[PDB]
Each structure stands twice: as structure tokens, then as C-alpha cells.
Amino acid sequence: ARWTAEHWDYLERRMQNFCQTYSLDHTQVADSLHEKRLHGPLSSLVKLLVQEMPSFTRRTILRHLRALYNIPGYEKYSRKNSSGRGDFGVQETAIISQEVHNFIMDQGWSEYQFCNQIWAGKCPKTIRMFYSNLYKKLSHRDAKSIYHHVRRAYNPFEDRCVWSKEEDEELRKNVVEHGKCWTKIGRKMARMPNDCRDRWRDVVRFGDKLKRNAWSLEEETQLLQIVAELSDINWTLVAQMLGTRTRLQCRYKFQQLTKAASKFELQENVWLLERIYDSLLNNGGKIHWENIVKEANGRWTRDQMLFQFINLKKMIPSYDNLPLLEATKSAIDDFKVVLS
DNA sequence: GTAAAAGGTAAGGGTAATGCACTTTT
DNA sequence: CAAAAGTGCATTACCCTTACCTTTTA
């Protein structure tokens, strides 16, 4: 499910055996991993890893592999032993797994019994004491972080990514029936309460109004209007008001629209409006951006030009006087006069 | 008794992993 | 040509943190 301490130990061991097999050094392997395409035994080795580690893609296995020998750029995929915040280091999870295994062997519990007692509404004194000692052995990290981690990692629910159409529906009806009560709902569906929230907030809440296609000009414009009415930005509320895109989709689209672009001057605005006006005339009453992006070639991305067009429509008085076609032609002509 | 510390639950938040359409390489 | 594999882009799987309660501990 996730890259744990075991997965790193497997990689390192498989790599040590690789070197011994072909009489190679770790420096020689690191040199091969600087190249884009792999060859020979190293190519055969990765193929094995992909098969031996089905929980991960070849792309992500390579990212970890290249990180293991250190290849610049792959630092973020490198092994982490400990941290005070965010993701748990491989040594932290190892300590937890050791403490849980010790606590479970004591008192004679199964790991299933352990998970149920953790999630038994109000945990008993033995569980409360288990937490206390665990916090001391991870004193660097906030005790609440460890508390949330353990619950998520040790649960009685069936953890899986596949939600069916019916299960999605059953969730909906539960929310209609009981409200935003994910613990009550979660137990009814044998699902981790947080997973129920996520399924609802990011998928099922939207119903059939959710879109996967490319954003429309109207959709992108609406997105800009709602961010103007508002940390600073609550993407969950943003998606709710837009109604056709998830919070992460909105968060992503907004970032692309507002990315750092080259300063649009008078001449730059003219070229854009002229390239748009060509698409308005030659093509149907629509804007084909495929040709516009290509002619820009690196200076602006699609979303950046769209962002600029939105602001031009809002600021140029011609767009309040005339329809899109004529207003654009008027906007260009007015832009050409001031250039004198 | 008290106040401090910690559990329980839901809102808020964010990135590595991945799918996809694509080019590139064997 | 098929097939294996790399890659930018948008989405997904999956996780963590904060806020605000109630409950337990000292």
C-alpha cells in the first residue's frame, strides 16, 4: 500500500546481491542510473522488482531506486528515518509496529482485537496507557499526530480503494439519513469514517454534476469569481460553489491560471487578441487554443493565456459594448491607436 | 473539589502515486 | 511494423493537521 521500511530493506538487499552477482560496485550502478534508459542486467533487475513489488508502478520503483544511490532531483523520494511532522519515517513506523506487537503479545490479544479496542468509542485504560508509553518513545513528534496515525494504521474496517456504484449510493443515502456523521455511517458500511468523508466530499457529494472533461471558459471564469469572494482560500467551499469540479481540481486549475507569466504589455495583448480573433473568424464562433499555444511556444501556457484573456474581457470597455466577435476586433483596434 | 492533559470526532488540508495519451527506444 | 519504456499533465489514493468538543488524569 505504501513504501515502508521493509520495502527499503528489500531494495537494498536485492541491490547488494546484484553487485555480488555481476562483480559491480555501488558507484557503477549509480553511474548507470544517471542514464535515462537502462541496459543489461540492471534492466533485468528492475523487471524483477516490478513483479516482486506489485503494490507500486515501475515509475515509482525507479524513483526510489534512483533515490537510493543519490541521483539529483530524486531527493524527495529518498528514505526518511524520522520526522516531527507530516509523513511518518520508516523508523517511526518500526517503533510503533514494535510497540503494538509487544502490547498485543502481552494481554494476549490478536491484532484484530487490538484494532477494535482502539476504535471502541471510548478506549479502555490499557489502550490509554499504551498511547502514553508510545508517546514517550516518539517524544519529538506531537502526541496527537501519533494518536491519529495509530488509529488510521490500525482499524477494524476493510481498507480498500474500490468503491462500487451501489456502495457510493449506500453512502449517499446514509448521509441523507444521518447527516455528516462519519463514525456512525462508517460502522454501518464497515468503512473507515475518514474514507467515508473523503468519498462523499470528493466524489459522491457532487452526484452527476461532476465533470472530467476540459474546463469551459465559463467554468474557469466562475472559478475566478469565487476566489475573489473569500490559508486564505478554502478549496472545499470553492468546489461547493462551483459545483462541477472537486476541491483538488479547483486548487490545481487556479494554480495553473495564476502561474507566474511573462508581463503582458500593449503589443503582447494585441497579438493575443489577434490570434483569438483569427480563431473567432476562421473557425466557428469558438477559440481553438491548440494553435495559439504553439505560436507562443513556452512563453505562456494555455491556462496563462486564458487567464489573461479573462482579465482583458473584464477590463477592456469594448467587451461591454459589443458581442465577443466585434468586441475583440474593437479591442484590437483600440489597442493599436494608443501605440503611437 | 480544581486545572491541566488527553481522548473522540469532524472540518480543513496536501502530496506521492498513478492513469493517460504521448513520444521515444529496442 | 510490434512491444517495451520513458514523460508531461491532470487526477486519484491516501494520508496528516487543526478545531472543538468531552473525558480522564494529577
Same domain, A304 and A242: no
Spell out the residues 6+ positions from residue A53 whose beta carbon is closer than 8 angstroms to its own. A7, A10, A61
Q: How many residues does chain A have?
A: 340
The number of domains in chain A is: 5
Among residues A203, A210, A213, which one has the least CA distance to residue A242?
A210
Nucleotide nearest residue A83, measured CA to C1': C16
User: Residue A271: exposed, middle, or buried by beta-carbon count in 10 A (0-12, 13-18, 19+)?
Assistant: middle
- Would A82 be classed as within a structural domain? no
Taking the CA atoms of residue A187, residue A193, residue A199 and residue A201 in that order, the dihedral angle to the nearest 10 degrees is 130
A125-136 and A90-105 helices, crossing angle to 10°: 150
Distance between CA atoms of A207 and A176, rounded to whole angstroms? 13
Residue A330 lies in a domain: yes
* Resolution of the structure in the document, Å: 2.7
Cell (9 digits) for A237: 467551499
Q: How far is the CA of A50 from the C1' of B18 (A)?
A: 15
Q: Can you give the three-state secondary structure of chain A, one letter per residue?
A: CCCCHHHHHHHHHHHHHHHHHCCCCHHHHHHHCCCCCCCHHHHHHHHHHHHHCCCCCHHHHHHHHHHHCCCCCCHHHCCCCCCCCCCCCHHHHHHHHHHHHHHHHHHHCCHHHHHHHHCCCCCCHHHHHHHHHHHHCCCCCCHHHHHHHHHHHCCCCCCCCCCCHHHHHHHHHHHHHHCCCHHHHHHHCCCCHHHHHHHHHHCHHHCCCCCCCCCCHHHHHHHHHHHCCCCCCCHHHHHHHHCCCCHHHHHHHHHHHCCCCCCCCHHHHHHHHHHHHHHHHCCCCCCCHHHHHHHHCCCCCHHHHHHHHHHHHHHCCHHHHCCHHHHHHHHHHHHHHHCC
Contacts of A289 (CB under 8 A, 6+ apart): A279, A302, A305, A306
- A274 and A331 in a single domain? The answer is yes
The letter for the amino acid at A328 is T
Last residue of a domain, one of A48, A77, A106: A77
Range of the domain at A195: 165-206
Method of structure determination: X-ray
Which of A77, A104, A138 is the last residue in one of the domains? Answer: A77
Q: How far is the CA of A248 from the C1' of C12 (A)?
A: 10
Phi/psi-derived region of residue A207, left when phi > 0, alpha when psi is between -120 and 50, beta in every other case: left
* Residue at A256 is within a domain: no
**In this structure, is residue A52 part of a structural domain?**
yes
Specify whether the backbone of A243 is left (phi greater than 0), alpha (psi in -120 to 50) or beta: left
Within a 13 Å sphere around the CA of A237, how many CA atoms are in the beta-carbon half?
Answer: 9
Is A136's CB less than 7 Å from nucleic acid strand C?
A: no
Domain assignment present for residue A125? The answer is yes
For residue A140, what is its C-alpha cell? 519529538
The reply to whether A312 falls in a domain is: yes
- Nearest-CA residue to the C1' of C11? A249
Q: Which amino acid is at A153?
A: A
| Nucleotides of B strand lying within 7 Å of any protein CB atom | 6-19, 25-26
Q: Is residue A85 part of a domain?
A: no
Instruction: Tell whether A64 is covered by a domain.
Output: yes
